[PDB]
């Protein structure tokens, strides 16, 4: 019978179009979120930079202080 063929064709058609739409949106989504992650990493690196500079300056000042008793 061709009627069962109609059934299977239309159900596979709907399935495939739904999959196509969702999979088409996924790429824009994941690009957005990877950009966000890059931004967070850069912010954290900036704070770490500041902390390292402070640590170096403070250690140098200590070594200046204690020398020669």
């Amino acid at each position: 019978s061709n009627f069962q063929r109609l059934q299977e064709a239309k159900q596979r058609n709907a399935q495939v179009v739904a999959a196509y739409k969702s999979a088409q949106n996924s790429v824009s989504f994941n690009q957005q979120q990877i950009t966000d992650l890059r931004a967070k990493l850069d912010k954290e690196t900036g704070r770490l930079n500041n902390e390292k500079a402070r640590n170096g300056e403070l250690k140098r000042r200590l070594k200046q202080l204690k020398a020669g008793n």
Partner: protein
């Protein structure tokens, strides 16, 4: 009614001629396109019906006669031999009882038994009427079948093309996920380093103030 071979052909051509003469008003006509074989001999009954190979239903002789009408319909009448047993042989009276139109049994209305007699004009007119009644739906059926073929082919091609397009998106997502995990690890490492360094700085600052309180041990 008729012999197996000595009266069948003549009765069939006469029946076809009667059908043709009284089916004049309707565009449907009855006949056969078959013209013998490659050899071209005279005294040939070109116009008429066709006869099929004998079969046996439940131990009884069966002999068909197919009348292929125009417009795609057919009329078939069936003979059987009560006077003779075993094979049909030849020179043997035959009985016409079953009338079929488009493979559907229709003897039930064309040939009731009534008054222990029956004329042929009723039969001919009745078959003509049912043929011209049925032709409309018998013709729309083929169109709906062809439309079904065309539409299913188009739809299936659509689905295959779309799936071929779909294929690679999972792999794309997988690569994205790998990059995401790497970014998370990087962020965690940087944050841990920063907090540890802060604790170190606070301890050293406390020591610095404590030592400057006394002036570097004089």
């Amino acid at each position: 009614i008729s012999s197996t071979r000595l009266q069948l052909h003549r009765t069939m051509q006469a029946f076809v001629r009667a059908l043709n003469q009284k089916l004049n008003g309707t565009g449907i006509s009855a006949g056969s396109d078959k013209t013998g074989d490659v050899a071209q001999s005279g005294a040939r009954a070109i116009g008429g019906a066709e006869i099929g190979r004998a079969r046996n239903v439940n131990g009884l002789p069966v002999l068909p006669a197919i009348i292929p009408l125009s417009d795609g319909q057919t009329i078939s009448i069936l003979f059987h031999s009560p006077t003779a047993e075993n094979r049909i042989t030849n020179s043997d009276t035959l009985v016409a009882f079953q009338f079929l139109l488009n493979k559907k049994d229709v003897t039930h209305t064309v040939a009731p038994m009534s008054g222990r007699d029956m004329t042929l004009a009723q039969v001919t007119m009745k078959l003509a009427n049912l043929a011209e009644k049925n032709s409309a739906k018998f013709q729309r059926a083929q169109k709906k079948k062809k439309a079904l073929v065309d539409e299913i082919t188009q739809l299936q091609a659509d689905s295959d093309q779309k799936e071929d397009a779909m294929s690679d998106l999972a792999d794309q997502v997988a690569a994205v996920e790998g990059q995401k995990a790497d970014l998370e690890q990087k962020i965690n490492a940087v944050a841990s380093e920063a907090d540890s360094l802060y604790e170190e700085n606070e301890r050293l600052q406390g020591e610095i103030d404590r030592l400057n309180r006394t002036g570097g041990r004089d």
